Design a protein around this ligand. Structure first.
Ligand SMILES: C[C@@H](C(=O)N1CCOCC1)N1CC[C@H](NS(=O)(=O)c2cc3ccc(Cl)cc3s2)C1=O
Ligand SMILES: [Ca+2]
Lengths: 52, 234
């Protein structure tokens, strides 16, 4: 149920509020329009391996 | 690191190395942001004056990404104790900011409840460093990484001759020849989740390296998130 079922479909942090899932992101990311994906604000976001 | 594999280009970009007056590594660290490094409190008693190096994978050649940084302030946990290594955590503020690039980037700080329920219940974490390749060997000239299983807390407590406080966790193998080792202390323990890497621990201590019936002991970063946040505001 909720955050226990596949992380509530969240990319990063999952929180349960009143029988409902709330997703959020690490510092340097903003939550996408779908309320689930996390989008990097700028170059070299935290937690990503470097490629170029 | 005993066993494991070399970090390939761009794979371990959050690694820092603490270097002494003779430009020799004695401990690791984790890049948290352009001004801050996470390390072990016990590492601070291992050299009078030190600097921090980032962007390095081979200490014998120049790759082009290397940068040395001077330390402005040392923030050590005031409850740290040498007898047990409880509260083994410190944060360093650098004099000049780190310019991120290939092989130089920060690891993410997670939220406590989600990390404990979702990250620390994954099968494995990843530890890395330039430390000894065998218990009695010499330090590695190459940066290494190793996948290490989370270990059941009760089993860990039974295996240990030394106390495991609420501020520590265990990881590694019962008998397989893979573990962190001398010189890796203060280095990153990170957990991968959907291709993003979060800080979950700090290389702390162990009874030898890769010994049978013994595990690697790590500072539990999730117990220190509000502490870390305060330190990074001053
Ligand atoms: C038992 C411990 C120790 O001296 N303690 C005294 C203070 O209270 C905590 C344990 N100890 C004895 C030797 C060892 N030094 S070490 O070889 O530099 C080292 C081995 C090792 C293995 C796995 C990890 Cl995760 C870290 C370390 S680092 C080490 O940390
Ligand atoms: Ca080099």
């Amino acid at each position: 149920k909720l955050c226990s079922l596949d992380n509530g479909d969240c990319d990063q942090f999952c929180h349960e509020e009143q029988n409902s899932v709330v997703c959020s992101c690490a510092r340097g990311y903003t939550l996408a329009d779908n309320g689930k994906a996390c989008i990097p604000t700028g170059p070299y976001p935290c937690g990503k391996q470097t490629l170029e | 690191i005993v066993g494991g594999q070399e970090c390939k280009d761009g794979e371990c970009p959050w690694q820092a190395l603490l270097i002494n007056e003779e430009n020799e590594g004695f401990c690791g660290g984790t890049i948290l942001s352009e001004f801050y490094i996470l390390t072990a409190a016990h590492c601070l008693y291992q050299a009078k004056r030190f600097k921090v190096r980032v962007g390095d994978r081979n200490t014998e050649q120049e790759e082009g990404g290397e940068a040395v940084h001077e330390v402005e302030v040392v923030i050590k946990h005031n409850r740290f104790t040498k007898e047990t290594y409880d509260f083994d955590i410190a944060v360093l503020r650098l004099k000049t900011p780190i310019t991120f690039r290939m092989n130089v980037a920060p690891a993410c700080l997670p939220e406590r409840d989600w990390a404990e329920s979702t990250l620390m219940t994954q099968k494995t974490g990843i530890v890395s460093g330039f430390g000894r390749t065998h218990e009695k060997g010499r330090q590695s000239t190459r940066l290494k990484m190793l996948e290490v299983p989370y270990v059941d807390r009760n089993s860990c407590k039974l295996s240990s001759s030394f106390i495991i406080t609420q501020n520590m966790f265990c990881a590694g193998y019962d008998t397989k020849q893979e573990d962190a080792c001398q010189g890796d202390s203060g280095g990153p323990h990170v957990t991968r989740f959907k291709d993003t890497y979060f800080v979950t621990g700090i290389v702390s201590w162990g009874e030898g390296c890769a010994r049978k019936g013994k595990y690697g002991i790590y500072t539990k970063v999730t117990a220190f998130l509000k502490w870390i946040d305060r330190s990074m505001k001053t």
